[PDB]
Amino acid sequence: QVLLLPKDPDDERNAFLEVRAGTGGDEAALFAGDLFRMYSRYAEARRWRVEIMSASEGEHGGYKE
């Protein structure tokens, strides 16, 4: 029942969280503004730095990338 056997490289490194619109077009680019709101609020629960480097917005709102 011992829990920490293996090692893990890359495991503490910072991420590049990319979110892209799938099927739906203007609405798949409108749920993508709610996955970014899912993880950017999760990264503030445990004190991380979101850094919006590139973002192209949808027509009716959200993010297409």
Partner RNA sequence: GAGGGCGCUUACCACUUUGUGAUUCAUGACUGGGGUGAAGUCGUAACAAGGUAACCGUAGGGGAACCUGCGGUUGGAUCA
Q: Please list every residue from 25 through 54 that binds RNA, using CB under 7 A.
A: 25-26, 28
Q: Among 1-9, 19-27, 30-38, 45-53, which window interacts with RNA (CB under 7 A)?
A: 19-27
Q: Enter the tokens of residue 24.
A: 């739906």
Q: Enter the tokens of residue 43.
A: 């990264």
Member of 4, 9, 13, 23 binding RNA (CB under 7 A): 23
47: left (phi over 0), alpha (psi -120 to 50) or beta: left
Residue 47 Cβ vs RNA, minimum distance, rounded to whole Å: 34
Q: How many C-beta atoms surround the C-beta of residue 62 within 10 A?
A: 21
Residues at the site binding RNA, with contacts judged by CB under 7 A: 21-26, 28, 59, 64
